[PDB]
Amino acid sequence: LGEYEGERNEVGERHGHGKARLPNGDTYEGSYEFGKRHGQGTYKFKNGARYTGDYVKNKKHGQGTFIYPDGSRYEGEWADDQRHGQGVYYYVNNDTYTGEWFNHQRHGQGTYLYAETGSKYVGTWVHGQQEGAAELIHLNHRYQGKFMNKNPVGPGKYVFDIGCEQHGEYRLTDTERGEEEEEEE
C-alpha cells in the first residue's frame, strides 16, 4: 500500500534506482533488484532513524551507515541484517567503539573510548561484553589483565608512564591486591 517512482522490470518487480514509500511512512531511495533492495540506498524511518548503505537481497550487507533513534550512530560492514566485521559505533554520551563484530554484538579485538574520561579499553570482546585479556588504557597508566563482567577478575598488571609496573591480582569483584612485586621498564 504505497507508491514507487522508478522503473520496473518485465513482471512488475522493482529494479534499479527508485524511490519507494512504504505503508507506515518509511522511505527507501536507492537501487533495487528483483523486487528487493540491492545496492547503495538510503532507507529512512518515520521515527527518525536512517540507514544509508549497501544492501544484498533485502538485508544489510557490506558497508553501511546507520542512524539510531536514541542518538547512536554506526558505520561499518554489515552481513545479513546484523553488524559483522570492522565497525565503528558511537553512543549517546559520545562514547565511540572501534572493533570487530560477529552477530549484532562486539566480538573480537575492540577499542572502546570512554569520552567522559578520555580513557581507552583496547582488548577482546565476548558477546558484546568486556571479556578476555585486554588493555584499559588511561592517561598516565594502563591495566593489562583479565576481564570477566565489566570489571577486572584475576591476575593483572598496571603499566605506568613513570617507568615502572605494578603486579597484582583481583581477589574480589572490585578489590585489587597489590602484592607483591614491582618491575622495571
Partner: protein, 51 residues
C-alpha cells in the same frame, strides 16, 4: 544526553566557609586558593595523587 553539574557554593555557606591561602616557604608571598566546585573537584576524590 548531558550529565548535570552541581553548581558552586559562591557564598561562605558550605565548604567555602573559610578562604585558604597557600605559601611554599615562609617569606614568599601567599597564593590564594580558588573556590571549589562540588561535582568536579570533591566528587573526583577517587583519585589519589602526590603533591
Amino acid at each position: 544526553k548531558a550529565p548535570q553539574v552541581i553548581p558552586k557554593e559562591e557564598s561562605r555557606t558550605g565548604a567555602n566557609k573559610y578562604v585558604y591561602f597557600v605559601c611554599n616557604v615562609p617569606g614568599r608571598p601567599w597564593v590564594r586558593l580558588p573556590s571549589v566546585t562540588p561535582a568536579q573537584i570533591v566528587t573526583a576524590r577517587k583519585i589519589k595523587k602526590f603533591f
